[PDB]
Amino acid sequence: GSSGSSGMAKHEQILVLDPPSDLKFKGPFTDVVTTNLKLQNPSDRKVCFKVKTTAPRRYCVRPNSGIIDPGSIVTVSVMLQPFDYDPNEKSKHKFMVQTIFAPPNISDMEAVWKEAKPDELMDSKLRCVFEMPNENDKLNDSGPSSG
Numbered sequence: 001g002s003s004g005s006s007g008m009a010k011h012e013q014i015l016v017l018d019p020p021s022d023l024k025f026k027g028p029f030t031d032v033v034t035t036n037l038k039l040q041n042p043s044d045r046k047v048c049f050k051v052k053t054t055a056p057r058r059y060c061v062r063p064n065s066g067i068i069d070p071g072s073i074v075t076v077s078v079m080l081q082p083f084d085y086d087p088n089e090k091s092k093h094k095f096m097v098q099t100i101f102a103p104p105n106i107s108d109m110e111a112v113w114k115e116a117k118p119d120e121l122m123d124s125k126l127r128c129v130f131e132m133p134n135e136n137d138k139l140n141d142s143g144p145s146s147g
Helices: 109-115
Strands: 016-018 022-026 035-040 047-053 059-062 065-067 073-080 095-101 122-131
Touching: 022 035, 047 059, 047 109
Parallel strands: 022 122
Antiparallel strands: 016 035, 035 073, 047 065, 047 095, 059 073, 095 122
16 A cells, blocks of 8 residues: 545545545456455544445445444445446446444434434545456565565
8 A cells, every 4th residue: 555645625534444545346256246345433432334335236235334433443344246247347336435423322323324414424435446356476465475
């Protein structure tokens, strides 16, 4: 990884998505895929996140929601259903993750996300990149061989 932002835009987010740039997907595509999404929480208070994508039919996220403890990272399992992938596919699909702090009496989630207004709810624009398993050179470390 290497710090590098492309353009300055307006976005108010508290939860640091990982990868924050784009979420790569290890193929193949002709079979069930498995992609782990890391979600870092810099804040020191509970926060609720709602996983929502444009292709909820070809995507299986679990947990599909929940709260990320303050100062911790969560690993979400995003399984991609096997479908006819095209090499000349267009950049349409998109992944939008919603995040919002949790109340002191956070009991019913369905009630929170509901009461929450679209003017306070924080979201993030992310793109899912489909990669192929066809590796070129085995990788173990970015330096030494040991371990």
